[PDB]
């Protein structure tokens, strides 16, 4: 140990990341007609506990019928999962929602379902995210959206109100404009712009207010005479290849897994 420490017994890796593949394949038997020594061990000892488990004679499983391995985070979370949804009531108004891993913030004012679950499987996250948002209802409604990084000015969260920000400021942080008639959906990438090294969901109050946020999104409508239908917005997030995940946590207990029950 370079830290000036010494020991007589060893120190092996405990709970090592990505140990085996997630699809049945051959990376004979898997164990058999020999003697299952891995049927007994002293779990308290980290070394011994890694001894491969084996109890009876088995054969090699074989090959899975499907191409890709569904257990590769990149591919799994590659399926843009649900994030949140809101609805505009008056014209020339705006909504601003934060992207917060916080296990504390319960939906709708917080991370829901899968996304909630996923982001609490590990301690640190960093890297871009591909947000995609679906428009529901209205038509011929001009709209705009911008990504605001943690620690900067931005209209009050989880609240529909008249923007209090200079058009200049908004556009300046990089923004996008669209119209319900011509589209009905937007898929744009959110940058890893933060003064932190990474963000986390599992935290306590204080840090849970600064270090638990990727950033924020703000959507502002225009030309929406409410003589028209209603205007709904739904947001979904998908992890990118440039996204990283460090240190595995114990998954959230079921009682804390919540979902925004609707339809």
């Amino acid at each position: 140990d370079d830290s000036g420490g010494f020991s007589t017994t060893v120190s092996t890796e405990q709970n090592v990341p990505d140990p085996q593949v997630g699809i049945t394949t051959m990376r004979m038997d898997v164990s058999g007609v020999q003697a299952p020594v891995g049927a007994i061990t002293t779990i308290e000892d980290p070394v011994l506990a890694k001894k491969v488990p084996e109890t009876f004679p088995e054969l090699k499983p074989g090959e899975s019928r499907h191409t890709s391995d569904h257990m590769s985070i990149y591919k799994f979370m590659g399926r843009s999962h649900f994030l949140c949804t809101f609805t505009f009531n008056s014209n020339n108004k705006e909504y601003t929602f934060p992207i917060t891993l916080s296990s504390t913030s319960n939906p709708p004012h917080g991370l829901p379902s899968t996304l909630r679950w996923f982001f609490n499987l590990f301690q640190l996250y960093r890297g871009p995210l591909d947000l995609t948002i679906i428009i529901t209802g209205a038509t011929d409604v001009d709209g705009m959206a911008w990504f605001t990084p943690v620690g900067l000015a931005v209209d009050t969260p989880w609240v529909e109100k008249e923007s209090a920000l200079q058009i200049d400021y908004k556009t300046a942080l990089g923004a996008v404009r669209f119209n319900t008639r011509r589209t009905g959906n937007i898929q744009i990438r959110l940058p890893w712009y933060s003064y932190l090294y990474a963000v986390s969901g599992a935290l306590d109050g204080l840090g849970d207010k600064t270090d638990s946020t990727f950033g924020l999104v703000s959507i502002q409508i225009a030309n929406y005479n409410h003589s028209d239908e209603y205007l709904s917005f739904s947001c979904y997030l998908s992890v990118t290849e440039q996204s990283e995940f460090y240190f595995p946590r114990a998954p959230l207990n079921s009682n804390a897994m919540l979902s925004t029950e609707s339809m």
Binding site: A35, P36, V37, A39, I40, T55, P57
Partner: protein
């Protein structure tokens, strides 16, 4: 310095699907070894999976009459389900394994007197006949019987199912439903026997058993 032998506390023993972990163990004692009969006491192949499971057995047996109209179903059998029964040795294997996959060989025979005429058709249909055209039974692995010609037929098939194996104790749907219908009315001249009995033989092939179990139902 001489080391003096002391027993080996922990150890693991077992056979087939039974393992034991012992903490205050010791070694195993054995005497003599396996002896081969210089003069065998029995000349038949020693019992084996094939011996007892992959052999033939009489499933069902019925009659075919002059009264039986065209297409009359002379027999509808859940081949597999039928084998699963104390009546046959193969049971001893099935009765103790939860699931198993396999192929089948069916032999159907009869004994019509050359003074009789007509015929039947025997088909191995997977699952159920559903609403398939009786007239197209030839499509399924079949055997045709004609009095003037043959009095036997043999069909051999592999495992065909939606699942990777059949569950005996409590099945989902029969693997095979062997159907035997009148292919051409069995007529005769005045005086001849107005019938002919019929039997059905079956056996498993490439019998793959899985998961020993104590259940019975």
């Amino acid at each position: 310095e001489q080391m003096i032998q002391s027993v080996d506390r922990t150890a693991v023993t077992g056979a087939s699907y039974f393992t034991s972990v012992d903490q205050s163990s010791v070694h195993t004692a054995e005497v003599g070894s396996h002896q081969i009969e210089p003069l065998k006491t029995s000349v038949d192949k020693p019992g084996s999976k094939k011996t007892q499971g992959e052999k033939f057995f009489l499933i069902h047996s019925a009659r075919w009459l002059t009264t039986h109209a065209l297409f009359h179903e002379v027999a509808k059998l859940d081949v597999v389900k039928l084998l699963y029964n104390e009546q046959f040795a193969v049971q001893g294997l099935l009765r103790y394994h939860t699931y198993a996959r396999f192929g089948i060989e069916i032999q159907v025979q009869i004994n019509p007197t050359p003074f009789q005429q007509g015929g039947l058709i025997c088909a191995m249909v997977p699952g159920d006949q559903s609403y398939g055209s009786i007239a197209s039974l030839t499509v399924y692995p079949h055997g045709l019987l004609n009095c003037n010609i043959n009095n036997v037929v043999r069909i051999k098939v592999p495992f065909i199912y939606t699942r990777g194996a059949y569950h005996f104790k409590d099945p989902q749907y029969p693997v095979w439903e062997l159907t035997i219908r009148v292919w051409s009315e069995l007529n005769i001249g005045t005086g001849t026997s107005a019938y002919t009995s019929l039997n059905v033989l079956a056996r498993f092939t490439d019998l793959e058993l899985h998961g020993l179990t104590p259940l019975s139902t």
